[PDB]
Design a protein around this nucleic acid. Structure first.
Lengths: 271, 46
RNA sequence: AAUUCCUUGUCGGGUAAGUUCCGACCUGCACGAAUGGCGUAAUGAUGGCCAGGCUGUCUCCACCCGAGACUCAGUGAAAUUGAACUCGCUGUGAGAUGCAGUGUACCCGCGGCAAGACGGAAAGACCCCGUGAACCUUUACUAUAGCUUGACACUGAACAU
RNA sequence: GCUCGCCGGAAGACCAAGGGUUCCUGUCCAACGUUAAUCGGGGCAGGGUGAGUCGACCCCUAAGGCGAGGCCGAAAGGCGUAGUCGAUGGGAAACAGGUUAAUAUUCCUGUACUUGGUGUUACUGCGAAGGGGGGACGGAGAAGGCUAUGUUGGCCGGGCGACGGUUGUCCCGGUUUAAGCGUGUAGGCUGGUUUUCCAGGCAAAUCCGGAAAAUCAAGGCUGAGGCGUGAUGACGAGGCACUACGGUGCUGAAGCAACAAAUGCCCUGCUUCCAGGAAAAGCCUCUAAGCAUCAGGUAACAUCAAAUCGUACCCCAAACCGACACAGGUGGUCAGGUAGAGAAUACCAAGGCGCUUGAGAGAACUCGGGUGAAGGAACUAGGCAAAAUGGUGCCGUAACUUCGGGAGAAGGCACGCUGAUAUGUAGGUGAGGUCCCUCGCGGAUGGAGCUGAAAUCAGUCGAAGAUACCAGCUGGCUGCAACUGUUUAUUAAAAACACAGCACUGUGCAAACACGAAAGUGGACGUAUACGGUGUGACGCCUGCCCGGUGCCGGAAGGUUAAUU
RNA sequence: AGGACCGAACCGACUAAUGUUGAAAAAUUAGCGGAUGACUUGUGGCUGGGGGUGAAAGGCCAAUCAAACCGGGAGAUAGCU
């Protein structure tokens, strides 16, 4: 639920919380946890490769099952859990054979709801089937780009793709970006939308909240000196040049997709 | 005032010790130059 | 106006008196709407202004308590230094302890002051010069990483037009 | 040695780091010590550091490092797998007392404990580089139950006062005792037990997980402290003999209770919140391959072993970092009394110091402070500095406002001591006794004793009662930035930088982008409600006109146009 | 509950005076700010010079920074003193 805190202090005026009492108020499933050490945006050479990353709260990685390859075995949802490694919530599901796994929580999946994977699974939210058996025009998430490797599209809080066509061994998809991409008609997809839609309405309200997420402050570039950034300096606020990345790239319309390897699955790139 | 030298024998030996010098091509050249010069203390080991 | 050169703009407010401050006028030298415009409670070791209280901030300093300064004993530096038997004045040579003229002045210390010795300190940062540098900028020149275009190569097979 | 003064949340005590004999004794005073020096962290010599339980080593891993092969790279070399290193973390066990000039949880006394090896006996399904469990973990907050510790009383011993009084409701001192073993409490968590079955845990599994039944509710785990034992002991204020007045043998009384009480323990708990909170081993179990009148495993007893290195001393400092015996810097632990909200502050205890030049004088001037007639910002760039305000409780409190604030707005009244209410109240604590009982560290009742506010009334002293230290000046107008924050270490703390928020734009994942000749890595074990870049900078009302120029995104008829031919 | 309030430790460094061959190659004294957090701190680790890091000052990178230090090219060159 969305709730606006009261202005009892500067820093709580504009904070907007996304509270969900259905989430588990306890510890997560240990067998599906792993160490996840922070990097600070630094690579094996110790150099900052991605700026504005550092600090934040300690996080343990939940082993989420993006493949959903346990076919023909029903699973019941035990509880919805909070996952710090992603925007969406996860669901601890219990299979009939006694195996437990984590999955992305769809829109209206609750505790006790049954799910199933495979070609003979029912068309209901949470079930994962190859897009060959998914009716055209339906909404899915956690879509595979290559059969058997795992879902890669529509995994965020409230994301979803729409199957708009199915020509042959391929199917066409409307990605949340507006891109019209086509993938093989054997890649698995999960029915429904990822349910944390209110995640977008969240308002951090203060700088420290971003530091909790591991986001370090962003220095503009006009505030720097020319030795540090093209936008550089000047006596006062001058900025008399075309907007440009560090390292000299436009950043205001210049397309930088230079793959040319797929060049086939794209139809309606976007906009 | 906090000065520059804050001693730590562990960091001393790991940074300038014998095995740290013998672990790289250039560190081994340091010892060669100090041996040729005739240094009595090749390193900061002990 | 953090923006107004003319300029202390004009009027009003506040003061006995207000180049600042506040409120209006607009004649905006040269505001202006995300290099954001106008407002804005709260916040600020933030800038400016006005009051009460408070006072040695001041009128105008006085006294007192301590640490130094002063004297004795012990220890014992420093910058500086061409050499010195190292006065004033006027003039001279371009602002004189040292030249000319003249005046004054017994020899040597101690405590104080800091006008001068163009005092000490750092081969002036201003200025100019050097066919000196260094970083920075760009539609200065020449290049270049990168990005990108095509040809050939890795690279073949048939079919149809 | 007698006084005085200073620190006492340290200027005391114990450590790490670091240093490395500065430790103790004797001896010496040239140099070193900012003076003298018989003294010294100085010189010379000698002596001193004793561990199965402390720590390291060791077992285990984090970040990260190295890295067989391997991938990559002109060479050097780079990345990285299996692995192997790497604490700042996890992992078995010792306490008290006594003792040296200098060491001790290390020596001695007493009492203990842990992990292994071997052997004997008895009962036996043992076995992993594998599986599972466990280890294993956040912030804040809330009390409750305890202890350390303290206060008082009682008890024991001593004392009867340099000057009035002091045989009493007087004064001084002491009233200490551990680990371990046993008990398993306050309180916390969890429903247990048996059988059957199973797509899971890379194969298996009696283990974990899952499913369906039956049977009982009392089962278990964890757990401070207390009590008992340890302890007919040790310690013990003080005595009796030796007593070089440097100390040694023996003896050595009381050794209880109540109250208060932690930031420490129960608590790795409980509650709650979002930012969602290490790993591995030891340890407990499961079996596989394999081994079974073996080997191994379990328990008991006996016996052996537990090596090696460190241990002195300083450690907020004269011994470390600062060239100095330098107003500096330096992480952790212990945390007494009175007042106090308090680790502030003042004065004290334990304990430790008076800071390595002194003496005298009592000018100017400087420094650091105190007071000040009348005036009260007239000073000055500027109320710079100084002065002033200062506490608790009650009353009371404006514009404006994002309705939270503003606000401790402003401003006003009362604060001491004594007595009474009440021989010490409300409250808290809680004994004996009584009753119950699944007969226990139980419950109920009971209220002794102890402790103890706050308020009212009356009276009383002083110029002054938040009397000292401690301890907001306040209000009004306005610019800038929303705010908390960040910044030129060493002349600039700001209106600058961040900021939440907003927008544009890029990016479909082998993402864009970045570090890299490359491999690869980060981005991200993320997937457009995501990520990167740019600008703006809470919020509120808004964000207008111009695409000629430059750039960017698109497009095509044609022109022009490289290598090549 | 709080990048909440007052205020020690702790972390900072707004004002003034002193000091300026200082006690100190940036401190002392009196006040000052933050003080559950974008906090602070110990230990160890990573990032290496046209590079790092930077809530951005051209700041910091061993008292040195508009391109560290050491060595070398090197007796650079100096129409200037």
């Amino acid at each position: 639920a969305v709730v606006k805190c009261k202005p009892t202090s500067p820093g709580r005026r504009h904070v907007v919380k996304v509270v969900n009492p259905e989430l588990h108020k306890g510890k997560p499933f240990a067998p599906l946890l792993e160490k996840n050490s922070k990097s600070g945006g630094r690579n094996n050479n110790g150099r900052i490769t991605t700026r504005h990353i550092g600090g934040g709260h300690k996080q343990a990685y939940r082993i989420v099952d993006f493949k959903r390859n346990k076919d023909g075995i029903p699973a019941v949802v035990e509880r919805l859990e909070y996952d710090p490694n992603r925007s969406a919530n996860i669901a601890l599901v219990l299979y009939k054979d006694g195996e437990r796994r984590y999955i992305l929580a769809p829109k209206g999946l609750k505790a006790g709801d049954q799910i199933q994977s495979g070609v003979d699974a029912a068309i209901k939210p949470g079930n994962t089937l190859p897009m060959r058996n998914i009716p055209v025009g339906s909404t899915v998430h956690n879509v595979e780009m290559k059969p058997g490797k795992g879902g890669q599209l529509a995994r965020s809080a409230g994301t979803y793709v729409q199957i708009v066509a199915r020509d042959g061994a391929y199917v066409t998809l409307r990605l949340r970006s507006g891109e019209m991409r086509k993938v093989e008609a054997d890649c698995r997809a999960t029915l429904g939308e990822v349910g944390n839609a209110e995640h977008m309405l969240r308002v951090l309200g203060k700088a420290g909240a971003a530091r909790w997420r591991g986001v370090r402050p962003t220095v503009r570039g006009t505030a720097m000196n020319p030795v540090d950034h093209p936008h550089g300096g000047g006596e006062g606020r001058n900025f008399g040049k075309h907007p440009v990345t560090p390292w000299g790239v436009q950043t205001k319309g210049k397309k930088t997709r230079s793959n040319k390897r797929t060049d086939k699955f794209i139809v309606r790139r976007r906009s | 005032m906090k000065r520059t030298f804050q001693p730590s024998v562990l960091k001393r030996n790991r940074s300038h010790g014998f095995r740290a010098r013998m672990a790289t091509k250039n560190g081994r050249q340091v010892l060669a130059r100090r041996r040729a010069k005739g240094r009595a203390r090749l390193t900061v080991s002990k």
